[PDB]
């Protein structure tokens, strides 16, 4: 049960600093170095630096030298990386990972999404994407939740408190012209389950402390009034 | 400082086939202890990186035989045999011999599978959102392959432009398909000004384009 816990997200102003933490458990803290890896879509994975709790040594890459301070508190089994004078080039997901001498990166944290921006935090509005005949084809119905106008990333969406995973698609967020993000999460289910199974999307935007559980209810369509072009 | 150059940037491979990823170090990465600390990591969509290969050719516990690493000195190669849908992701080499340690630039594996036509679904704006003053109309293309697809909006049968945003998932880890959402965003005034909303979809898997449509007030 070795694990490395990181906060999910940090919104920080340009020119300010951020403190990343990596809280280890399930093993003897001193037996493993903690290394820090920056991930972005295009520049990939970027080894930032490392701290060894046994010897007390630290190191960091050339680009981040002078801006990064790596430390560790052995008593509370927590490693730290402080990064100062942030710009938007520093926005990224930062992972911590552990390394025994002559070993390898076998366990990783789940990553801290750092957004460098002067805009404020904003929780999302959640709207149902109600299943109906317009979102049914054959025996399959689709339903979902629209997660609109939040900042910054990320948001998590689960279905039925995690009991429903098959057929779920949570789309990449899109930056709207407003500067706010929006996303949809959808799921396909048997159309016969619409009358008998309750579907709830659990949206969590931790940077704003916004937690929403939205029951998505089926809607009937009145096809008689429909005008078509064919 | 020790530069790791990975090729190719993207790698199409048919399912059940074999993929070959190469990585070249700018200097030698043999460590004074004799070993070469060259590792291959995989990052699947939505997950942390995970270890595949350490010590050019040794397999981390739980990693199938289909993954084999090799190389020497300057030139290293990861081979994936009998590729499965779950192998989708970005593969990275990594040298841990000379501080500062460095990752390669990554290779994005692209799995080729049979043609699969999208299922198309359309969602009118919710009453709740309409209270708010905006209307989002969502058109969903579910589980299709290949990725190229054209989605057009028509409002009272007039083609739309400039008011829709679309987003596409990564290749699915179970069936190697994509899914796509296209969101038409209108002021509530504009939405109540028209009657018919239609999403028209062209995709190689469809004999002819598919249109899903509804009327304001219908559902």
């Amino acid at each position: 049960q070795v694990q490395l816990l990181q906060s999910g997200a940090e919104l920080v102003r340009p020119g300010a600093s951020v403190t990343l933490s990596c809280k280890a458990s399930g093993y003897a803290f001193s037996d493993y170095e903690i290394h820090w890896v920056k991930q972005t879509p295009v520049r990939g994975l970027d080894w930032i630096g490392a701290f060894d709790p046994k010897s007390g040594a630290s190191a960091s890459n050339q680009k981040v030298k002078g801006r990064a301070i790596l430390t560790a508190d052995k008593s509370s089994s927590t490693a730290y990386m402080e990064l100062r004078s942030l710009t938007s080039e520093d926005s990224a997901v930062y992972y911590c990972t552990r390394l025994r001498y002559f070993g390898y990166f076998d366990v990783w944290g789940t990553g801290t999404t750092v957004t460098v921006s002067s805009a404020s935090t904003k929780g999302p509005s959640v709207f149902p994407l109600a299943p109906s005949s317009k979102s049914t084809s054959g025996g399959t119905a689709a339903l979902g939740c629209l997660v609109k106008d939040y900042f910054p990333e990320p948001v998590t969406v689960s279905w039925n408190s995690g009991a429903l995973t098959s057929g779920v698609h949570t789309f990449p967020a899109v930056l709207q012209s407003s500067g706010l993000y929006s996303l949809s999460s959808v799921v396909t289910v048997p159309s016969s389950s619409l009358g008998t199974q309750t579907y709830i999307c659990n949206v969590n935007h931790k940077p704003s402390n916004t937690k929403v559980d939205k029951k998505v209810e089926p809607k009937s369509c009145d096809k008689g009034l429909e005008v078509l072009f064919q | 400082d020790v530069l790791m150059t990975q090729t190719p940037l993207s790698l199409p491979v048919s399912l059940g086939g074999q993929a070959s990823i190469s990585c070249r170090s700018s200097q030698s990465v043999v460590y004074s202890d004799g070993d070469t600390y060259l590792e291959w990591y995989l990052q699947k969509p939505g997950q942390s990186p995970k270890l595949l290969i350490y010590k050019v050719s040794r397999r981390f516990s739980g990693v199938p035989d289909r993954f084999s690493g090799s190389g020497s000195g300057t030139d290293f190669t990861l081979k994936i045999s009998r590729v499965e849908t779950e192998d989708l992701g970005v593969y990275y080499c990594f040298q841990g011999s000379h501080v500062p340690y460095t990752f390669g630039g990554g290779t994005k594996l692209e799995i080729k599978r049979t043609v699969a036509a999208p299922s198309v679904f359309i969602f009118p704006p919710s009453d709740e959102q309409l209270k708010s003053g905006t209307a989002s109309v969502v058109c969903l293309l579910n589980n299709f392959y290949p990725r190229e697809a054209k989605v057009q909006w028509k409002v009272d049968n007039a083609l739309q432009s400039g008011n829709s945003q679309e987003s596409v998932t990564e290749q699915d880890s179970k069936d190697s398909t994509y899914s796509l959402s296209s969101t038409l965003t209108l002021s509530k005034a504009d939405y109540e000004k028209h009657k018919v909303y239609a999403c028209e979809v062209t995709h190689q898997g469809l004999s002819s384009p598919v249109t899903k449509s509804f009327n304001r007030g219908e559902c």
Binding site: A50, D52, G56, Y101, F102 | -
Partner: peptide, 8 residues
């Protein structure tokens, strides 16, 4: 990797 502390 070797580890930044392995030589100490």
């Amino acid at each position: 990797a070797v580890g930044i502390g392995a030589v100490f």
